[PDB]
Amino acid sequence: RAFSQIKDAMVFAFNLPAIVELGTATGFDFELIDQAGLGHEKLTQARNQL
Amino acid sequence: WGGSYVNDFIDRGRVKKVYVMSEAKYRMLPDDIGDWYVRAADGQMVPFSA
């Protein structure tokens, strides 16, 4: 909180997880792949849609 | 007469190869070697048969 006051500078504070070198909060890790010669500047859209 | 790869270009997002080489109909018979010249220090166009 005390940090959510520096102008442009996301300064979050957080606590280490259970076991450092393992996974994390029961969310997902999701990868968007490019399966034809589609460019960065094309994948980036696809990503932004989703 | 035996192609040479030079470096890679990017294709449709993929690193791929670049070969220089002759075209088919300039490397087929032992009498085509006649077509090839080569630059001299003097600047001349000297053919193999010299």
Swiss-Prot record, chain B:
This is Multidrug efflux pump subunit AcrB. Homotrimer, with large domains that extend into the periplasm, interacts with AcrA and TolC. AcrA may be required to stably link this protein and TolC. Interacts with AcrZ. Part of the AcrA-AcrB-AcrZ-TolC efflux pump. The lineage of its organism: Bacteria, Pseudomonadati, Pseudomonadota, Gammaproteobacteria, Enterobacterales. It comes from the Bacteria. The chain holds residues 754 to 803 of 1049 of the full protein. AcrA-AcrB-AcrZ-TolC is a drug efflux protein complex with broad substrate specificity that uses the proton motive force to export substrates. (Microbial infection) Involved in contact-dependent growth inhibition (CDI), acts downstream of BamA, the receptor for CDI. Its role in CDI is independent of the AcrA-AcrB-TolC efflux pump complex. It is found in: Cell inner membrane. Disruption phenotype: Loss of susceptibility to contact-dependent growth inhibition (CDI); inhibiting cells still contact the target. Induction: Positively regulated by MarA, Rob and SoxS transcriptional regulators (at protein level). Belongs to the resistance-nodulation-cell division (RND) (TC 2.A.6) family.
